[PDB]
Amino acid sequence: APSYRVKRMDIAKNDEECVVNAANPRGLPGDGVCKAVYKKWPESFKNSATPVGTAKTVMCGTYPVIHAVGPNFSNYSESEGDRELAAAYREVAKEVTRLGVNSVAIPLLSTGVYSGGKDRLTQSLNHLFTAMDSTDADVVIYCRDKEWEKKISEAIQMRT
Ligand SMILES: COC(=O)c1ccnc(=O)[nH]1
């Protein structure tokens, strides 16, 4: 049975068959999540650049890194940001399905430096669910904050 789980830990140390990078459209290392990811899979950043609201897979050996570019809400309107955030997760689902993986490590896109200083846990997570509910891979969501871990854990529990 495909499940959702949540783990408070560095996504760069995931035990899934592929990772989603919370990427910038330029395909740059940046800092935060994208740093950890650049350090663990640096050859995955060869031609990783992809537009806002899209996902691009680059192999590190045989290990797929999915660069998903959620919107920077500093730059977008709430309604355009929402559209772009939904579509990035949609692209993740397509890439996970194309890759035929049994599991995927995924961060909550647009909830850090790209949040525009707003709490978007529920917005980002719901878009993740909408997208990934149609796939048959185990989904492990990575966060750093305990409060976020619990709230994510509850949102998972209350769908079953
Ligand atoms: C994951 O938290 C973020 O703010 C983020 C940064 C870069 N790209 C994203 O898609 N999201």
Distance of CA 7 to the CA centre of its chain: 13
- Tell me the C-alpha to C-alpha distance, in Å, between residue 8 and each of 2, 124, 130: 20, 17, 22
Q: Reduce the DSSP state of residue 20 to 3 states and report it.
A: strand
Which of 128, 115, 123, 124 lies closest to 72, judged by CA?
115
The answer to whether residues 71 and 32 touch, using CB atoms and an 8 Å cutoff, is no
The Cα–Cα gap between 113 and 129 comes to 22
Counting from 1 in the atom list of ligand 1, the atom nearest the Cα of 68 is 10
Residue 152: which region, alpha, beta or left (left: phi > 0; alpha: psi -120 to 50)?
alpha
Unique residue bearing structure tokens 């730059």: 75
The Cα–Cα gap between 144 and 139 comes to 17
Q: Quick one: tokens of 107?
A: 């961060």
- Find out whether the beta carbon of 139 lies less than 6 Å from any atom of ligand 1: no
Helix (H) or strand (E) holding 119: none
- Find out whether the beta carbon of 116 lies less than 6 Å from any atom of ligand 1: no
The Cα–Cα gap between 85 and 27 comes to 17
Q: Reduce the DSSP state of residue 143 to 3 states and report it.
A: strand
- Tell me the C-alpha to C-alpha distance, in Å, between residue 17 and each of 3, 12, 79, 122: 15, 12, 33, 26
Q: How remote is the CA of residue 120 from the centroid of ligand 1, in Å?
A: 11
Which of 122, 52, 106 lies closest to 80, judged by CA?
52
Q: Quick one: tokens of 68?
A: 């998903």
Asked how this structure was determined, the answer is X-ray
The answer to whether residues 19 and 41 touch, using CB atoms and an 8 Å cutoff, is yes
- Find out whether the beta carbon of 54 lies less than 6 Å from any atom of ligand 1: no
- Find out whether the beta carbon of 132 lies less than 6 Å from any atom of ligand 1: no
- Find out whether the beta carbon of 109 lies less than 6 Å from any atom of ligand 1: yes
* Resolution at which this structure was determined, Å: 2.2
